[PDB]
Write a protein that binds this ligand. Structure first.
Ligand SMILES: C[C@]12OO[C@](CCC(=O)O)(c3ccccc31)c1ccccc12
Lengths: 219, 220
């Protein structure tokens, strides 16, 4: 089968910027009728995908003149001459020259801005949850930039890679930063079997992780 | 005006069956090729099946055998019979009209959601997230709300009934074990809270749930 590979998976841009998104097919994609069915789609947040370019370079009627497609062999490119706020979203490439038809993973067009260290907040189990027998330890690493970030948990000094659920927000529409929540879920008994709970964030702004924690008995 | 409207999507137990429909307008099925394409929770687009204006049918090996596409040319309705369903089959299904040997997916419908799960309607557990004494020594303070183990999605969480809007981050729900868990955080001035009231309002329509949790400072 032919696999489509898109790069980058995230393209931070500034408005007015000229951009190029790439799509690589695992092999040549020429239909036996000689046409190259390489299509480009843009999906706006909350909307279904919309056609931009078909057969490599044909801009679909109604699509802005700043979008264009090109490429050959196994290399294909989508270009936006002067990025606008409306162009933000995720672009997808697709090959339909050979079955099975295949989509690329997509490239997210995002906004550039100044680096931002995350604000880290740790929250011990609630007394209500404890009562029911549960113990969720949550941590928030908020408003950071770039979006890349690592979170490490430590219980009584030892790392806890197991039992962690993370979620990420999309880029904030107001300050263009990113946030992430990390919840260590334990049991009332398990939680009571340790005193120190630490949440560490590794952002390109810290290297030496931002550390936040509490003690089950003291603060 | 070309129009495509998907229906039939819904909750279905694994190994179960579901029939999806797609009512078209503005064109004839005898003149255009139709396809079904799905977007997974991870936002991955996947080709499900297609039928040419002449009736020729194609499926990828993963869908082959399990799903069946057909069409009612007279009533202009595209169908997708789904069987042997699995959690990976959970996605938004779109019927698409394309132009013969020109463009595969020229026009997409808004889609219909199909959720494959064994879970049963479960109300969420809402817990107030109060700061630790070491984080409350600054000019601002972040509060939180943990909405745990509910089904199905979604829930509606607000702060002070929506009164509290800025500085909020409600994170996307994730599966904890066939059940969803979500959390929200709100950051305000230290003089705002606990000086002023802050409550987490969570609703879960599927279970007729509407709970409120006021964040109280910790400590004996
Ligand atoms: C829209 C479309 O028209 O005809 C084909 C091929 C027809 C064939 O391979 O027999 C096709 C090929 C390339 C781009 C679009 C299409 C097709 C098949 C199935 C669904 C939609 C289409």
């Amino acid at each position: 089968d032919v696999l489509m590979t898109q790069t980058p998976l995230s393209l931070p841009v500034s408005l007015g910027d000229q951009v190029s998104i790439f799509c690589t097919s695992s092999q040549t994609i020429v239909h036996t009728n000689g046409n190259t069915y390489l299509e480009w789609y843009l999906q706006k947040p909350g909307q279904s995908p919309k056609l931009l370019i078909y057969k490599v370079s044909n801009r679909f009627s109604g699509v802005p003149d700043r979008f264009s497609g090109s490429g050959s062999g196994t290399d294909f490119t989508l270009k936006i001459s002067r990025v606008e706020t409306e162009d933000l979203g995720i672009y997808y490439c697709f090959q339909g020259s050979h079955f099975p038809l295949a989509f690329g993973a997509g490239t997210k067009l995002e906004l550039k801005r100044a680096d931002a260290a995350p604000t880290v907040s740790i929250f011990p189990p609630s007394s209500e949850q404890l009562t029911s027998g549960g113990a969720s330890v949550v941590c928030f690493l908020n408003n950071f930039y770039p979006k890349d970030i690592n979170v490490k948990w430590k219980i009584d000094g030892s790392e806890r890679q197991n039992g962690v659920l993370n979620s990420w927000t999309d880029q904030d529409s107001k300050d263009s930063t990113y946030s992430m929540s990390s919840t260590l879920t334990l049991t009332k008994d398990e939680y009571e079997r340790h005193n120190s709970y630490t949440c560490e964030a590794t952002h390109k702004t810290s290297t030496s992780p931002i550390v936040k924690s509490f003690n089950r008995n003291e603060c | 005006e070309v129009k495509l409207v998907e229906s039939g999507g819904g909750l279905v137990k694994p190994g179960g069956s579901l029939k999806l429909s797609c009512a078209a307008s503005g064109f004839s099925f005898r003149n255009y090729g139709m396809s079904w394409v799905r977007q997974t929770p991870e936002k991955r687009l996947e080709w499900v099946a297609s039928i040419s204006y002449g009736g020729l049918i194609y499926y990828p090996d993963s869908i082959k055998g399990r799903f069946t596409i057909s069409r009612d040319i007279a009533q202009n309705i595209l169908y997708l019979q789904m069987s042997s369903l699995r959690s990976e089959d959970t996605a938004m299904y779109h019927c698409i009209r394309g132009d013969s040997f020109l463009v595969w997916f020229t026009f997409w419908g808004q889609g219909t959601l199909v959720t494959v799960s064994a879970a049963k309607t479960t109300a969420p557990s809402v817990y107030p997230l109060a700061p630790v004494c070491g984080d409350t020594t600054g000019s601002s303070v972040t509060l939180g709300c943990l909405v745990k183990g509910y089904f199905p999605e979604p829930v509606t969480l607000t702060w002070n009934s929506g009164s509290l809007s800025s500085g909020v981050h409600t994170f996307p729900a994730v599966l904890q074990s066939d059940l969803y868990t979500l959390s929200s955080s709100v950051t305000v001035t230290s003089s705002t809270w606990p000086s002023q009231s802050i409550t987490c309002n969570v609703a879960h329509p599927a279970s007729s749930t509407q709970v409120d949790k006021k964040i109280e400072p910790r400590g004996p």
